[PDB]
Amino acid sequence: YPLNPAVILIAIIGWSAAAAVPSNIPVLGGTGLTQAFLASIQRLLAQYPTGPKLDDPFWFYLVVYHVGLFALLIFGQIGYAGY
Amino acid sequence: AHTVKIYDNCIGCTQCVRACPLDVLEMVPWDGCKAGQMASAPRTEDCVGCKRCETACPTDFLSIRVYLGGETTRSMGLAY
Amino acid sequence: MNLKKYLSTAPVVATLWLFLTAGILIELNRFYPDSLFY
Amino acid sequence: PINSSSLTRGYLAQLPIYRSGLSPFLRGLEIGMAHGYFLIGPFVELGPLRNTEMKYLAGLLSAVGLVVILTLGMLLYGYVSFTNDSQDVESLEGWRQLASGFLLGAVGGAGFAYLLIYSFI
Amino acid sequence: KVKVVVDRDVVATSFEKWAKPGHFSRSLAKGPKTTTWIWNLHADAHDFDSHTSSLEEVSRKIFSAHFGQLAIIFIWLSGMYFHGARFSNYVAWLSNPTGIKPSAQVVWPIVGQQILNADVGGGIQGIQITSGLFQLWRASGIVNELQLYVTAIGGLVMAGLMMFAGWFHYHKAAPKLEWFQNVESMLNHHLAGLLGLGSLSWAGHQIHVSLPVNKLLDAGVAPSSIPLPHEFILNRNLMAELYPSFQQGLAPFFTLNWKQYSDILTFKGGLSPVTGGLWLTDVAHHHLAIAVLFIVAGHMYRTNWGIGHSMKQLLEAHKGPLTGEGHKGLYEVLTTSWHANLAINLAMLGSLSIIVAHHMYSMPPYPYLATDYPTQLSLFTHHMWIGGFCIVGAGAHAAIYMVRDYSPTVNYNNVLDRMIRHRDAIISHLNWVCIFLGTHSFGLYIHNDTMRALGRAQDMFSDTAIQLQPVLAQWIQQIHTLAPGNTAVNALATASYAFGADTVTVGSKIAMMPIKLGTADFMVHHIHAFTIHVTVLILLKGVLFARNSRLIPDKANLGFRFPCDGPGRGGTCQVSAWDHVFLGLFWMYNALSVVIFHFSWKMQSDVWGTVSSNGTVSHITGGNFAQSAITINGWLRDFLWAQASQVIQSYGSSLSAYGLMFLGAHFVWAFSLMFLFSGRGYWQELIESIVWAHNKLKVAPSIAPRALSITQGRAVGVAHYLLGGIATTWAFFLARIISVG
Amino acid sequence: WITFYWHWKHLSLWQGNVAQFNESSTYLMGWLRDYLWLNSSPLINGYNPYGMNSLSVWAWMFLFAHLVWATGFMFLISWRGYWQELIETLAWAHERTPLANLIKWKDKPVALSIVQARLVGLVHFTVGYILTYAAFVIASTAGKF
Amino acid sequence: SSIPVIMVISNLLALAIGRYAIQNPSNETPIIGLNLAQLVATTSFGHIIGVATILGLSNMGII
């Protein structure tokens, strides 16, 4: 297994740029997934002690980002290792 | 260990010896039956007491008999 | 002759005999209902 | 970096039970400290006196109670398992020193966890 | 390459072998000397790969036997339609779906059994049915008894054709092995031809018959006054009145102006407020979308024209560095073993029956199903049981594959071989997970029983004490509630009201509403996780150790089904793969019993019930699940004891058959324990004394009486245990829900 | 059967409703409904969501006894070979688990013997049978009078 | 007007994709160089791609 930690560098920029496309409107904004997700952490780390509720869409921006990131980086391992 | 005995009504068919998965039994020369051979149980230290030998014995009643005795690593069939 | 041998097999004759038996008992209770004594 | 063998046995090698140089007592002591410290947690927060003034005391005493049973268990194991006696852990003398280490460690570790929660309540 | 090749006039049609019991087996053909032979005849009758070594001859029996099964299914369906036509209140029920109880079984007046002809309404007396046939037939647009009669006759003609085809493809035109091994062709045809065209042609029925009939029924038109289905096809103006898109005809389909069919093909979600069923315009569109998917899917596999995938090439390509030769060999395994295929197919069909159970209660697909609580409870429970049995069967056939069909040459360093090579790691970890799940799921109930009994309600796992909120399930409910207009932009309403949003009522009765998950729901879900992991432990252990263990190194030679390898090695009772299936059945029974009890109680407590004019929900068991379902005592008292009231008070009423069957089923269950707890050695010795008495009176039979085999004792035991246990719940459920629902 | 009969006949006598026994005892639903189901109510309400009373111990014992009875079925229905094969994997796992594999059994763990499991199964069955009825016969009578 | 144009392009692209995509193309056809089986296969793909694209742009109010 060649490893090469640069797979993680491509996994971030590769997914983030693809996820930063402008969407329609609701429970996202129209900016994108990342722009909503990076805005969700900004207004949550502002109140560092008191964490999010189940009502908050942060939990959706977390799962759909990570389940997209983990998908893009796992398929990143197979590609670099198995040319 | 288990005790395996061969009684005189043994017809020397070899079926018990063929059935034994532990090689406990063997056929020995004997004038007592037409087959000219009798089952023997020389290696009963290896006998697990599965009674495949008795299942195979065609005589009524059995000519080979397994008396389950004191358990050992070998007789309990333990690979640990 | 082979069909008749089949119809003489245990389960067929048992089915037909117990059908006939059940029919007689059912029909006796249809015409003589609620017989608690002779 | 193999992961299965290299990182596994590399990590395991540095654990107090396996680490080269340690006397049975210091292996025990390190194992004790680690266990005593975390073992107080469930008793403090989920025990029958968790919503009383005795929440923390009850939690500490319970942990010491459990640790005593574990140490007695250790001693019984060693007595039964090791008829032979030597300085190494897997021996009558070594296992008793390990047990002594574990008990001191775990009572101290428990005590230390109790001290920090009182310090930073 | 893909060709039809058959042998002609391969088996003469003669009654000769009918008069020769056990002709099919070399061991049985000689006939009985003992009663064991009679059982063996039946146990072996369908074990075709034991009769002959020829894969061709096995395949041909299977294909022909399958037609026998379809023939029987057609007789059964025909029966259901004929009973609907002749002995039902279906026509009356169409005019009052909420008021009349569906009934399609009338009992004869004999020995007082006519008490079972219940006051169901619609001018008949009969047994209330829970199969949901009326809701199915109403969804299909059936309004009169002629339509049901003609379907029943059609069914008998299909049964006849299936019998002819079974006979024909065994006796006259038997396909060769190479015909059956056309898996690529079979999958193209089954995907595009069976599922694709099935769904397309059904969508056709829905758009042309179901839609117009149900729209007029839902508007309140008298079913007799509704135009017959063919009038909607003949007169397009009739159809255009109901769905204006029919003005534009098929021009919008060929021109890709598909939005014109927004009236007939919708994405409304939710339920009809009239019927409490899925919108049939949603269902018609679903079936169109599925049909396309399946017709497209069935172009995947290479047949006679170069294009398409080799399933062999696909399997062999899916090879990584952690899984050796990967899926190499599996194409050979699945083209040479019927049991391998039956293993997969039962796993998926069984798992499908369970998915169907969950989807059909929560998204009630049929009109007036949701508020027919007997039907809802019956359909969920039924499809759970069928699913459970199929999954255990998957275990049986996976293990039969391992004993009879597995070769190390085919499975060399492939995923199957590699699994066998760490069976100890697999089973040790699953064992551990079963102990972890059992202690931390069932332990919570025992903790709770103990704390409640000790007067320590504040020390319990409950919504009001130590809360275990199923926060992930709660979070998923929220996402599904927020879906319409958001992540499902064109969906007007939720897939299911089970997830959130509104309470749907039909009359006063609740069709569906949000199913709130709390501590009681968290706890029972971990029981389900637990009971499923253990069942998997038993069946998977059966498969991975089918051929050998450290205990029995030559287990494959002893076969799939054998009682033991004797009392030695400490005792080897129930080492066989068959005995794992035997044990798997009890755990499946355990697992699914708790599922259908969870369902029954949760739905009665928190979902089903009445909504007043004020608009206050009164549930059947008034929300007792949250505080009662967190202790075993609560299950015993507030579920079994409380809800058994209906079945045990049923004597002298139309539900008395359920009371009788409740006791009858308890009897059969208890009777099973005689077989499960005993051994044939006792029974053979008892029979010796009974045989002595017959010999004394010169009335001993030539067919020597034998105690059942060790294996048959177990088979009889588990069969009566399951029959008794399941039939008990059946009587309990139907008596309960027909009374209170 | 003997003790059920004694108890129901006496419950009916003591209540002054001999007619209940006389009419209900001639069919088995009468026994299930008018004896077992009817008299279970005080017992199973020994504790409930609303609180607990002096019958809580009989309610808890009752469930305990049903559990013990059912645990017996495991030993009576599932026989040795299943268990010995499972124990083999657990022995395998223990020896290959780091830290844990420093600890050694002195006695090789094996599945219970064929006869042992009959005895252990019968003891759970018998204990469950006795404690279940003890809790019922005491709590049903104590709860009623 | 846009529907025939997109459909012809999608069919022509699927035909071009087909020359590289299909295992062992014909090259015994005057201009397209695919056999009838492959022509039906590619045009079938071109229809699915065409219908899906058209419905994509129609849903987005582009055509």
Ligand code: CLA
């Ligand atoms: C089996 C599951 C189960 C669970 C989870 C609980 C939980 C609880 N019980 Mg109950 N109880 C149970 C079953 C259970 N019980 C049963 C079967 C009975 C018999 C009737 C009882 C009878 C009972 C009584 C009489 C009492 C309790 C009490 C309690 C509470 C405190 C117990 C305590 O201090 O534990 C101590 C726990 C530990 C020392 C450790 C637990 C295990 C650790 C956390 C595992 C960690 C593994 C880790 C992740 C591995 C990582 C390794 C590496 C990677 C680093 C707690 C809420 C008490 C209470 O007051 O209730 C509120 C109490 O008085 N229980």
Ligand code: CLA
């Ligand atoms: C119509 C007349 C007919 C005749 C004379 C034959 C004759 C024969 N068939 Mg053929 N066959 C037929 C129709 C016929 N078949 C049909 C309709 C089918 C499609 C199912 C087949 C498919 C078929 C197969 C797959 C096989 C045969 C075989 C045979 C031979 C042995 C059959 C035997 O012993 O069955 C006697 C068995 C029965 C009478 C039981 C039949 C069970 C039926 C199908 C289902 C019963 C319904 C339901 C389950 C009942 C439940 C009731 C409840 C009490 C539980 C014999 C030459 C076998 C053979 O070995 O030939 C060389 C063989 O393997 N046949």
Ligand code: CLA
């Ligand atoms: C369009 C093609 C087509 C269709 C519809 C089917 C359908 C079926 N096959 Mg398959 N099969 C096919 C092609 C097809 N096959 C090909 C090419 C092969 C060789 C590669 C196979 C090899 C095969 C085997 C080996 C087996 C099957 C079996 C089945 C049945 C599975 C059980 C089921 O789902 O019952 C669903 C039942 C129905 C939908 C009712 C009966 C339908 C009948 C048979 C007619 C359907 C088609 C007809 C054109 C309809 C006309 C419509 C009308 C309006 C004009 C099912 C009837 C199994 C079986 O049960 O065989 C008896 C089985 O063992 N098939």
Ligand code: CLA
């Ligand atoms: C109520 C009846 C009952 C109970 C309690 C058990 C229990 C068990 N079965 Mg058995 N089983 C049963 C009926 C039962 N079975 C029957 C009738 C059959 C015949 C079909 C079987 C056949 C069978 C098979 C074939 C298998 C099982 C397995 C299991 C184990 C599952 C793992 C687990 O959860 O362990 C944990 C224990 C429990 C959940 C029981 C109670 C736990 C309590 C509440 C918590 C702990 C209490 C604490 C330690 C007590 C201290 C008190 C003390 C100091 C006095 C578990 C030991 C499987 C197994 O071994 O999995 C690894 C397995 O493969 N069973």
Ligand SMILES: CC1=C(/C=C/C(C)=C/C=C/C(C)=C/C=C/C=C(C)/C=C/C=C(C)/C=C/C2=C(C)CCCC2(C)C)C(C)(C)CCC1
């Ligand atoms: C989450 C996570 C995890 C886990 C974790 C863990 C597992 C941890 C643990 C930890 C621990 C478990 C710790 C502990 C500690 C302890 C301590 C810190 C102690 C100390 C003590 C002291 C300080 C003292 C003592 C004493 C006294 C006091 C007295 C006398 C005696 C003596 C001396 C003993 C991991 C990593 C996997 C991964 C990532 C994430």
Ligand SMILES: CC1=C(/C=C/C(C)=C/C=C/C(C)=C/C=C/C=C(C)/C=C/C=C(C)/C=C/C2=C(C)CCCC2(C)C)C(C)(C)CCC1
């Ligand atoms: C209920 C029931 C029944 C009934 C049944 C029925 C009555 C059925 C029907 C069915 C049907 C009646 C079907 C149909 C079908 C059809 C189809 C499947 C078609 C299709 C077609 C297509 C696919 C097309 C194509 C195309 C294209 C794509 C291109 C252009 C042109 C066209 C359009 C031509 C019975 C009796 C069995 C009994 C049991 C139950």
Ligand SMILES: CC1=C(C/C=C(\C)CCC[C@H](C)CCC[C@H](C)CCCC(C)C)C(=O)c2ccccc2C1=O
């Ligand atoms: C009760 C019991 C028996 C005894 C049961 C036997 C032998 C089966 C009884 C046979 C029944 C009664 C059918 C025989 C009926 C004849 C075919 C006659 C029919 C007459 C008419 C109805 C046609 C065992 O042999 C056995 C073996 C292994 C484990 C447990 C047990 C077990 O529990």
Ligand code: SF4
């Ligand atoms: S099977 Fe019996 S008769 Fe044959 S050799 Fe062995 S002991 Fe003798």
Ligand code: SF4
């Ligand atoms: S008790 Fe029965 S199953 Fe167990 S070893 Fe003996 S003969 Fe075999």
